[PDB]
Design a protein around this ligand. Structure first.
Ligand code: HEM
Ligand code: HEM
Ligand SMILES: Cc1cc(N)nc(CCc2cncc(CCCN(C)C)c2)c1
Ligand SMILES: Cc1cc(N)nc(CCc2cncc(CCCN(C)C)c2)c1
Ligand SMILES: C[C@H](O)[C@H](O)[C@H]1CNc2nc(N)[nH]c(=O)c2N1
Ligand SMILES: C[C@H](O)[C@H](O)[C@H]1CNc2nc(N)[nH]c(=O)c2N1
Ligand SMILES: [Zn+2]
Lengths: 407, 411
């Protein structure tokens, strides 16, 4: 019931007690592990509020205080009267930071307590949402010196007045099916692009077209807005050794900003809560550029390198992969846009884990997501046993709104 | 009940029904996943259902389920269990059981080969000397002058747990490791403890960087005995690089035969505590783990120096760059010497086809994503994008305690 995790490189053993506070389910059972699966009322609400408010008041060393009891008292009355309750600014900020702290798939959590929280609970229209998001984007970008941020829109009420950002990330590139049968742009975004066009977006039909925002306020029909082009910082990709690399015409955006997840705090649900940090290079260099279902550039780079592509065992794919990831890091660094390489980031996470075990009794981590998509075992996280479990406040997946929306 | 897995690269969705046959625990609960944890004397009462489950599976596989031959065999085993408290497998059942333990091994990416396994029945073995002879024969057969053949040798099953056969070596072929008084390590740092045991048992250590360890062999619960595998039976490959002529001067080599000898084979409730098995190497096992783990030969720095990479900051990816070259060299070297080896692209591609075939014809394929995905270049192999279900089927290979921690010394 008290669990040990071992690092097989260092022999360091940590003891996890924090897992005994998990509430949400994993998907696994005693008979089957689903560790590699990507997507596995007043009565209900008050214990959730209490559990959260208890952890909040413990965090500021006023557990069992009159102010603690008074708050609990106040929230219980508000739930009985109004069926929901409103978080204090202090609680909203605490909850947001802790949702990130609890994000088991995030390698960047050493940064968790440094999060700028934008309270957008006063927002009422899609135009309001657009303004808030532009300001988030500009703040977080900070001319290349990225700062972590989250913007939090009004909480779900009856579920018929949800605020949603229809985009999965604030900044993504369009994807288009060609008559030629090929795909132009980002293939992962063909469907969403179709929806934008359907809603009246005039698509430029290029390879790196920043998608417009599709914003839904108060359960109303989503509306289209274009992020000011000057607020979208992009980096052209070149290589320090290969002069030809620039000729590939590759670029990527500087701001990684997830916009499709649900923030749960104290049983309240924030269905629109875009958040952003800064990139780890492999995200772009390995996944965005080299996934066969994405920009899929391996072959073209390998040819430019004149590698022997006849046999898998020449490791031409692996060689081209490294160079692509070298180019990504070099380009961001040259343009002074914050980026972290997978060695530095995973080393940070190990230190974070050790801090968390030492001061919190554990750190929920998903090894399948934490280990980088290249060079796994030369990063320290590969050798680190991790326990995965769900704590609240949390960021959760939610259904894509076009399957949900009654137009 | 039906469970679906999806491949996120291809959108191929498979449906698992085989998991309904799973028995042992995973380590996970509804509240915690232990998917990245490495390591998460039977009564007759528990033995017959296990024997019967196995025999039913065996007779189904040969299309004789419910036959008189099937029923007579259940009867025969029941009587043997009630009479002698255990039972003996037929040779056909032993071979079936061993192939299926491999087929069921969720951490093994090489399972497309499972039906092709040479099974050496060593159940008539009685002494450590006898074990040595069987193991030499396995090494020679499996090696086959570089054209490797999968094989397993099966020593007598556990009885009262006080007469266990054990191979104390975790693998049949490994290099010695020596801890120096200055704290540095010579040879393979992973094998320091076991090397010390061997020396204590009387092994004369040459004290070099690549000394093949002797076999330490325990028969019938007796104290283990040392034997040196004939050097001419141990195939090794000097490592060189096709473009970098200095790579040979790193002085690296490795053995051709990967052979696990510390696992327990369970078939029909019987426990085979000494069952060494071997296949052929996937390149990354040597090039990534053996050579580049910080806790092993740890050659990344020296290699990157010789390539004159920028080692001042990690973001030059000098480690990744050197890592690829080392792995090219291992593959090049084995191929040049005509010793069987498979690259991680070939092996994972073959695994995906195996896995799909298993879903179609068997209703599933238990797989541990954490072990299946190679230790370099993960997401440019197809297994990275493949959702897997991990569960445990028998016959199976299991971990067991290291013998030095549990052995009662006779003296
Ligand atoms: C500041 C530097 C940060 C770094 C280096 C970082 C790194 C990463 C990486 C590499 C991933 C995997 C993404 C993928 O493979 O799709 C990830 C996932 C995630 N991150 Fe972080 N992140 C950072 C900031 C943040 C912030 C500010 C938050 C929340 C406020 C956050 C919450 C999450 C969540 C919930 C996931 C899982 C997303 C999903 O399931 O798709 N991260 N992070
Ligand atoms: C024939 C070619 C084979 C290939 C290419 C192959 C490949 C692999 C690889 C790469 C691993 C991971 C090794 C590690 O990281 O320590 C592994 C593990 C494993 N293999 Fe296979 N293997 C082969 C044959 C076999 C055979 C013949 C058996 C048994 C009859 C077997 C059973 C297992 C088991 C039980 C594991 C898990 C070992 C552990 O938990 O330490 N494999 N295999
Ligand atoms: C907060 C945060 C930080 C970070 N380093 N990465 C992310 C991921 C952001 C991201 C941006 N564009 C595109 C994607 C694609 C993700 C699709 N995955 C889920 C298959 C993801 C988020
Ligand atoms: C049957 C089989 C096939 C294969 N390709 N690899 C193996 C593993 C072989 C192997 C050989 N020497 C040493 C090791 C060390 C493994 C260390 N792990 C368990 C921590 C492993 C076994
Ligand atoms: C099937 C498997 O879970 C899937 O491919 C996962 C693996 N690990 C990952 N890890 C990260 N960080 N991001 C991902 O999208 C994935 N994809
Ligand atoms: C902690 C983690 O489970 C451990 O380092 C695992 C990861 N995956 C692995 N995969 C293989 N094939 N072999 C290994 O030894 C490991 N080690
Ligand atoms: Zn699990």
């Amino acid at each position: 019931r008290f669990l040990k995790v071992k690092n097989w490189e260092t022999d360091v053993v940590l003891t996890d007690t924090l897992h005994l506070k998990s509430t949400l389910e994993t998907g696994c059972t005693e008979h089957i592990c689903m560790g590699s699966i990507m997507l596995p009322t007043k009565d209900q609400l008050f214990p959730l509020a209490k559990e959260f408010l208890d952890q909040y008041y413990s965090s500021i060393k006023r557990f069992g205080s009159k102010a603690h009891m008074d708050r609990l008292e106040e929230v219980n009355k508000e739930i009985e009267s109004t069926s929901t309750y409103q978080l204090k600014d202090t609680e909203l900020i605490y909850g947001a930071k802790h949702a990130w702290r609890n994000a088991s798939r995030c390698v960047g959590r050493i940064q968790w307590s440094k999060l700028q929280v934008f309270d957008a609970r006063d927002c009422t229209t899609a135009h309001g949402m657009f303004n808030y998001i532009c300001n988030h984007v500009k703040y977080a970008t900070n001319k290349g010196n990225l700062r972590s941020a989250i913007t939090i829109f009004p909480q779900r009420t009856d579920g018929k007045h949800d605020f949603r950002v229809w985009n999965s990330q604030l900044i993504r590139y369009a994807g288009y099916k060609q008559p030629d049968g090929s795909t132009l742009g980002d293939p992962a975004n063909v469907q969403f692009t179709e929806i934008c066009i359907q809603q009246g977006w005039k698509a430029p039909r290029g390879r790196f077209d920043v998608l417009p925002l599709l914003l839904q306020a108060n359960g109303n029909d989503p509306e289209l807005f274009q992020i000011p082009p000057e607020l979208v910082l992009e980096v052209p990709i070149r290589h320090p050794k290969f002069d030809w690399f620039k000729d590939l015409g590759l670029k990527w955006y500087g701001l990684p900003a997830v916009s499709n997840m649900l923030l749960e705090i104290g049983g309240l649900e924030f269905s629109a809560c875009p958040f952003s940090g800064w990139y780890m290079g492999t995200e772009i260099g390995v996944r965005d550029y080299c996934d066969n279902s994405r920009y899929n550039i391996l072959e073209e780079v390998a040819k430019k390198m004149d590698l022997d592509m006849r046999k898998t065992s020449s490791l031409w794919k692996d060689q081209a992969l490294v160079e692509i990831n070298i180019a990504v890091l070099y380009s961001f660094q040259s343009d002074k846009v914050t980026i972290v390489d997978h060695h530095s980031a995973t080393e940070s996470f190990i230190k974070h884990m050790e801090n968390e075990y030492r001061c919190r009794g554990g750190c929920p981590a998903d090894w399948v997501w934490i280990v980088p998509p290249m060079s796994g075992s030369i990063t320290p996280v590969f050798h680190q046993e991790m326990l995965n479990y769900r704590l609240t406040p949390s960021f959760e997946y939610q259904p894509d709104p076009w399957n949900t929306h009654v137009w």
